[PDB]
């Protein structure tokens, strides 16, 4: 699981997700059914060449979140950036 | 607070910070007293335009890590990247 916002703008709703350390190819964008939009991410480590971890606090692995708009409510447009770490998916 | 790695190369310490949804600007990097590396960084909202919020789980606001290395070292070259929401700061 990870952070998400969801706006509502007039014509197309807007779904805001953390995904810190995720290189886009790692992200899935996906329509289950017509209804639910599935986001997905997986957080992977640089592979000791000398190289010694002090601290390690970052957790990894996938990042998911499911979110259902209403039924007959059909996804035909779908629009997703990555930026920053952050990703916004506008579904119309 | 935020989730901070650090590692240990042959002439370099290397911290790797999550700031998802921070923009570069945003990013303080910076040495107090010649010991001590500050890192720092603002999650900011994009400003009812007809847009209304139907969930909010991000919280914004001020991330910050302070990272003391040993006395009598002193930082005189100093990295920062900035990728996917992850700040990587490599300092001598």
């Given at each position: 699981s990870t952070p998400?916002?969801?706006k509502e703008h007039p014509n197309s709703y807007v779904f805001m997700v953390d995904m810190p350390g995720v290189k886009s190819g790692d992200i899935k964008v996906?329509?289950?059914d017509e209804n639910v939009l599935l986001i997905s991410?997986?957080?992977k480590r640089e592979e000791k060449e000398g190289?010694?971890?002090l601290k390690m606090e970052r957790r990894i692995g996938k990042l998911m979140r499911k979110f259902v708009?209403?039924?007959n409510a059909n996804i035909?447009?779908?629009s997703?950036?990555?930026q920053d770490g952050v990703l916004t998916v506008?579904?119309?």
């Open positions: 998400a916002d969801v996906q329509v289950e991410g997986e957080r190289v010694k971890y708009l209403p039924e035909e447009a779908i997703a950036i990555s506008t579904v119309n």
